[PDB]
Amino acid sequence: QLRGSTQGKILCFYGPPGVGKTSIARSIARALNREYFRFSVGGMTDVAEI
Amino acid sequence: SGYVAQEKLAIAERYLVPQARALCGLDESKAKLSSDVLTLLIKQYCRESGV
Numbered sequence: 315q316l317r318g319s320t321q322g323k324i325l326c327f328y329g330p331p332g333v334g335k336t337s338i339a340r341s342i343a344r345a346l347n348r349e350y351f352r353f354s355v356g357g358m359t360d361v362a363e364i
Numbered sequence: 365s366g367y368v369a370q371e372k373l374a375i376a377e378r379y380l381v382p383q384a385r386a387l388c389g390l391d392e393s394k395a396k397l398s399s400d401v402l403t404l405l406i407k408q409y410c411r412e413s414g415v
């Protein structure tokens with residue numbers, strides 16, 4: 315909001331599963347007005363998916 | 365190699381603090397960071413060969 319243009323950024327969250335992690339993402343999405351989307355990467359081994 | 369503890373001071377005073385300052389867009393007028401504060405940082409919160 316201060317330095318003009320939008321920038322991306324990375325973050326991480328951690329704790330017990332089912333703590334409400336995922337919910338805050340969409341809540342953010344409601345805050346920032348950008349489109350939401352999610353996808354699993356657990357257990358993936360091959361790189362073609364990424 | 366890695367980087368010497370003292371050497372990192374000379375790093376952060378020139379090649380690091382201004383860069384992040386330009387990422388946040390601030391000036392020392394609103395964001396001064398002395399050398400001594402930096403030596404305190406590395407002295408306490410971060411002793412790692414990478415910066």
Ligand SMILES: Nc1ncnc2c1ncn2[C@@H]1O[C@H](COP(=O)(O)OP(=O)(O)O)[C@@H](O)[C@H]1O
Pocket residue numbers: 330331332333334335336337338
């Ligand atoms: N602070 C919170 N506010 C609202 N819902 C919460 C909160 N903490 C936990 N939840 C509840 O936890 C459950 C799991 O949340 P979610 O983050 O979507 O799954 P996961 O924990 O697997 O990411 C949801 O039903 C959610 O309502």
